[PDB]
Assembly symmetry: C7
Homo-oligomer: 135 residues x 7
């Protein structure tokens, strides 16, 4: 497994969810321009692993075929100890793509391959998010 850089702040409760992700969901707000909540289903598992309070007015879901990889990954975030995740654009190997939240401060173009989990911290909002892939 390959662990992307966790970006955003140091706040909120630790989460680590790690089969392959076969669905992912991003709750976000216009009022605060933050990611607030994430859920993640796995490949042969009905269980929904979730984190942070879904207090936001939009959500998007990306379903992901068994053979489909992420080729284009970007997380928007505010940098610093006092930080937060603000947005995410993902693009797959089949042209599928999702845009969530805002990109007004800092960015990371992450590592690419088959998305295998996420890790970070979450409270009111998503304090910190880093992706995980295969080789």
């Amino acid at each position: 497994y390959i662990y992307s850089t966790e970006v955003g702040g140091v706040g909120g409760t630790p989460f680590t969810f790690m089969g392959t992700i076969t669905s992912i969901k991003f709750n976000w707000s216009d009022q605060y321009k933050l990611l607030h909540h994430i859920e993640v289903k796995f490949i042969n598992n009905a269980n929904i692993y979730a984190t942070g309070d879904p207090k936001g007015n939009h959500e998007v879901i990306l379903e992901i075929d068994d053979d489909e990889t992420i080729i284009g990954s970007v997380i928007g975030y505010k940098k610093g100890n006092d930080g937060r995740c603000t947005g995410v654009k993902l693009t797959t190997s089949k042209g599928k793509s999702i845009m969530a939240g805002y990109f007004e401060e800092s960015l990371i173009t992450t590592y690419t391959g088959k998305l295998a989990g996420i890790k970070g911290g979450a409270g009111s909002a998503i304090d910190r998010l880093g992706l995980i892939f295969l080789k």
Copy 2:
């Protein structure tokens, strides 16, 4: 199953519907929608080797689109717009086939899902005044 169920999105309201055939694939599908309420209201679905039209929800909407689908043609680009929550609704659908055919009906102002892809084999959900909830279904 020999089948992949997309996430049913929208609300928990209306009457359960499930359209599939023992060895059939969707060969045609229709979406009624309104400008006044920005909702999907009605759906119909024919299948291969079967004249029967399976329908659901009240077609009270002022537009409709139909996609016919060749026997060997797959869905490669699928998106459902919807309002999230227990008290939710479907608002729009874009489909794109494996032959460049594309239909786009509805509004996408709140929430989205980019679904799974393959040979469209049925739909599942709930419907009343409008389409409360919709999830697609594919082969392997």
Copy 3:
């Protein structure tokens, strides 16, 4: 039949027409339409190895387009605009062939169908003042 029938779309009005030949395929097809009423009004259709012009509905409209079609050339992109309902009408047609040839006729302001694809072999429907109803037909 050795034939695939597109959904006839539009209303139930006007006189039934059906154009197909024992061993022809459509070689030419014309669409008359108006700006004043935003309707298809008239259609004509020549066939391979046959000089006869098969026509329907009154050509009262201020524009027309013709698509000529090579012997080996297929339809890959077919769309009919229409008003839905028992008291309905066809409003427009975009066709695209397998050589990049394409025609746009009339208006697409209410409802659409993306039809099935193959070698265009005839048309069927009803016509009066205007084209009440149109469905295409292909080989397999």
Copy 4:
């Protein structure tokens, strides 16, 4: 005989013309047109291994375009703009070849035909003040 005749479009007026060679192909084509009247007025056509210019209609127009055509080069995109009816006229022509060459002449404000495609082998029609009527011609 070994030839495909596009539909002659436009009116029934002016003097008959038919330009073809026993085993030759058009190697150059010219279109005179006006801004004042938005008509094609004059055409000329040389053929392969033959310096003679076959011409028709009065060149009273303020623009002209010439398409030269390589020996192996085909027309893949052909369109004639025209006013429909017994009382009709040709208004414009777009041609596109198999090397990306293309020419645009005149106006397309009333009616169109997307013609048949292949190696252009002659033209036929009628011409007077202007080009009353034009149909193209191809090999197999």
Copy 5:
């Protein structure tokens, strides 16, 4: 000949020029033009295995462009702008080669020719104050 002569376009005025070799192809070519008069005024042409610079017409124009041409590089996109008539002139030239090189010179406000294509092997025409008349020439 082993050669294909594009149509000389423009007027009948000025002194005859013909730039050719028994076995040579243009290696470079230059177009002088003015903004004041919107005409081509002067041309120069080197050839492969010949240090002679062949020129014609008075270079009284305020811009020039040069296209150098690799040994294996062909013209795939050739156009000459010109005023038609006995009393005529060349106004512009766009060339595009087989390596994406291209030059644009002068103006295209009246008439055009899309010429034949191949490896450019000379030019021929008439020139005085300006370039009265220009035609290109290719191999087979």
Copy 6:
């Protein structure tokens, strides 16, 4: 060496830095920059098989970007914006890899370098308040 040193561009000011590892490559890089001063201010760099974060210059800037880089992924498109002269500075960087990944940081209003390409293996330069000077380094 086993390397290729791009040109260090910008000024001669600040403290010398050099980040390289004995048989390893940059696996991640970060650029801090400001809107207020239109400068690169700080850089950090992780390497393959090494948890250490090597950094330089004061991160007083209001934006940062990070590029992670797969083990087999190369830089194919590299550009550094900078103010030239003894009293100079780096103002921006665009990088593009062999997987379409790309990052933009800072401003490009004065001077540029399109660098050498291959596997990014370290950076070298000088830094103080800001990044006085930056040059990249690749594997031969």
Copy 7:
């Protein structure tokens, strides 16, 4: 020679320069230019297996660009802007390599040359205050 000389363009002024090495190729190249005078003013050129910087003309200009060039990377798109005449000057340069790298320097307001393509092996010309005259040079 085993070398191809681009046409030197611009004026006849300034001191002759010629940069070439017995078996090497340009590995780097730099263009100083001004907004105040819209001229190229200075050029520098490193070569393969040689740290020496060969330069010419006074760098009095407010911008510079550098193109680094991989060992196997060729120029596929080369253009020099210049004022023509005995009293002439170079105003700009666009280069494009065989890896998508490209640089734009100075102004293209009067005259151009699209040069010969291959591996850049040196430059020659004249320079003073500014770059009076520049021609490129390639291998076979």
